[PDB]
Structures are given as structure tokens and as C-alpha cells.
Amino acid sequence: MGVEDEPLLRENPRRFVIFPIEYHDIWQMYKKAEASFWTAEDVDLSKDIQHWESLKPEERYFISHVLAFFAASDGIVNENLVERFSQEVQITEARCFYGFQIAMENIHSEMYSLLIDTYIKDPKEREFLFNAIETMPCVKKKADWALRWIGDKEATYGERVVAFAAVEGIFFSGSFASIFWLKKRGLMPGLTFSNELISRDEGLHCDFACLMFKHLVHKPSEERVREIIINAVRIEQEFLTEALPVKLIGMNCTLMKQYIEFVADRLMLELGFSKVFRVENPFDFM
């Protein structure tokens, strides 16, 4: 107390000793992550260019901006893992998971950057996209929100792990759904396949957060979690209807907003709480 009460956070003089395994549930999530290892080199982009060039200009605009958003957001997720989560959490099984997640986020960032470099040849446009945190007001709201949680010296691990589940689970959900929308339309095989890998990885990353949450003795209140989650949904709904509207690829904004809320409900439930919005999933492809 405050921390010596928490098995996840209290002193572990065996932290760097791997065996024997004591947290089998945490360990199997690490093994699952490890078994699904992939690299950017595994994704075949050799046919994407033609698909890309036949798209409408606003579809290229929407896609390049989603890609720049993802590449930037990964670095912030990664920053949080490197400076905070992988440091403060003391159980070996979670250290292994977070170590592997960092490696996977670097793979995700590389993948998104290779996609950008494959589709966009103009060095000026590349740089504008790589520096999205500074150049794109739309991503600003999300980037700064996630970044505040890293700098917050007061928020408990229980709060901050919820916040990053919202980052990986809510802030990403609209963009993931957008790319799945394009798969329904049979466009860019490289993009849509990499998208399946990455959204799978992200879902596992969120599931892990919920597992860590469950193992906490002192959890934040349902009310506190509600307001982090609701807040995140609002930022996400705004990003997708105002900052970078999904109409640009032919999607119904209203249904998108509904999906974001369905996602947050599923996360609230996976966190041991009650639904906030009580809406259905409008997308049968998700």
C-alpha cells in the first residue's frame, strides 16, 4: 500500500527469472502473441499500386490519412509500453507479453510506413504524412489524449491500462472498420491483409489489458472507467464524422458512430462492468 498490496506491481525478486510459470492465464496470452509473429516482409504489396491508382482522389486522401494516423499512434502506444507499463509491472509473465508487444508495435509502424511509401512517391507528401502528430489537426486530439496518460504522474495503473485499451480498442476501431469496408469492396489486397493481422494483434493487446485489469486488487470505479471510455468514444466519433469523415469512402457516418459505441460496450463488458450505450453492431463485416 499503495503498491505493495498489488501482486502485479509489488516487488518480485524473481522478475527476471522466467520459470516456473505461476500466472498461466497471462503466460498463455504471451504464448499466443509469440505464435502469431509476423513481419512486414510477409505482406505482398506487389499488386496494390494498380488498385490504388484506380481509386477516387478522396479515397486516396482518406486512406493515406488513416495510415498516417496509425503509424503515429503506434509510436505513442510504444512509448507508453517502453517508459511505463513494461517498467512498473513486476510479474515475469506480463513483462514477456509487453516486451513482445513493443516488438510488434515496431512491426506495425514499419508496415504502415511501407504502405505509405509504396502508395505515395512524392517525398513532400511522405514527410507530411510521417509527421501527422504535428501536421494533421485531426490526429492531434487523439495523440495528445494518449500522451497525457503517459505524463500523468497521479493516475493509477488501473486507470492508465484502461486508457490504453481505449487507445488500442476505441481510437483504432473506426479506422479498422474503414479498411474492412474497403475489403468488402475488393480493393488493395496488401492493405486489407495487413489490416487483418494488425487488428487481430490490437484485439489481443486490448484483451491483455482487460486481463491485467482483472488481476488488480484496487480497481478504479465503474464511474471513473465510464468517463474515460465515454470520453474516448466522443473523440473517436468526432475524428470519423468531422476531422476525417468516413463519407469519403462511401460509409454511413451515423452507423459508424453506432459501431464505435458497440465497441466501447464490448470493452466495458470485458472490463467487468455494464454496457454504457446498449446499441447493436451495425456492421455485419465486423
Beta-carbon contacts of 217 under 8 Å, excluding residues fewer than 6 positions away, are 5, 6, 7
Among 6, 48, 93, 168, binds Fe ion (CB under 5 A): 168
Phi, psi (degrees; rounded to nearest 5) at 200:
-55, -50
Residue 205 known to bind ligand: yes
Q: Does 17 bind a second copy (CB under 8 A)?
A: yes
Among 202, 236, 261, 265, binds Fe ion (CB under 5 A): 202
* CB nearer to a second copy: pick between 104 and 179: 104
- Cell, residue 189: 489486397
Least gap, CB of 26 to a second copy (angstroms): 13
Among 23, 61, 98, 112, the one annotated catalytic: 112
Q: By the 8 A CB rule, do 195 and 180 touch?
A: yes
Q: Does 12 bind a second copy (CB under 8 A)?
A: no
Determine how many CB atoms are found less than 10 A away from the CB of residue 264. 24
202 interface partner picked from Mg ion, Fe ion, a second copy, none, CB below 5 to 8 A per type: Fe ion
168 interface partner picked from Mg ion, Fe ion, a second copy, none, CB below 5 to 8 A per type: Fe ion
Residue 24 known to bind ligand: no
Among 96, 212, 251, 268, binds a second copy (CB under 8 A): 96
- Cell, residue 69: 494516423
Q: Does 91 bind a second copy (CB under 8 A)?
A: no
- Does the active-site annotation cover 112? yes
Q: Does 184 bind Mg ion (CB under 5 A)?
A: no
Residue 65 known to bind ligand: no
Least gap, CB of 266 to a second copy (angstroms): 28
Q: Does 126 bind a second copy (CB under 8 A)?
A: yes
Least gap, CB of 169 to Fe ion (angstroms): 9
Q: Does 78 bind a second copy (CB under 8 A)?
A: yes
Least gap, CB of 103 to a second copy (angstroms): 4
Q: What is the DSSP string of the chain?
A: --STT-TTTS--TTTT---S---HHHHHHHHHHHHT---GGGS--TTHHHHHHTS-HHHHHHHHHHHHHHHHHHHHHHHHIIIIIHHH---HHHHHHHHHHHHHHHHHHHHHHHHHHHH---HHHHHHHHTHHHH-HHHHHHHHHHHHHHH-SSS-HHHHHHHHHHHHHTTTHHHHHHHHHHHHTT--HHHHHHHHHHHHHHHHHHHHHHHHHHT-SSPPPHHHHHHHHHHHHHHHHHIIIIIS-GGGGT--HHHHHHHHHHHHHHHHHHTTS--SS------TT-
- Cell, residue 10: 509489488
Residue 105 known to bind ligand: yes
Q: By the criterion CB under 5 A, which residues form the site for Mg ion?
A: 14, 17, 92
Catalytic residues: 112
Which positions lie near Fe ion, rule CB under 5 A?
168, 202, 205
Binding residues for Fe cation: 74, 105, 108, 168, 202, 205
The residues of the shown chain that bind a second copy, judged by CB under 8 A, are 15-20, 34-35, 37, 39, 41, 71-72, 75-76, 78-79, 82-83, 86-87, 95-96, 99-100, 102-103, 106-107, 109-110, 113, 116-117, 126, 130-131, 133
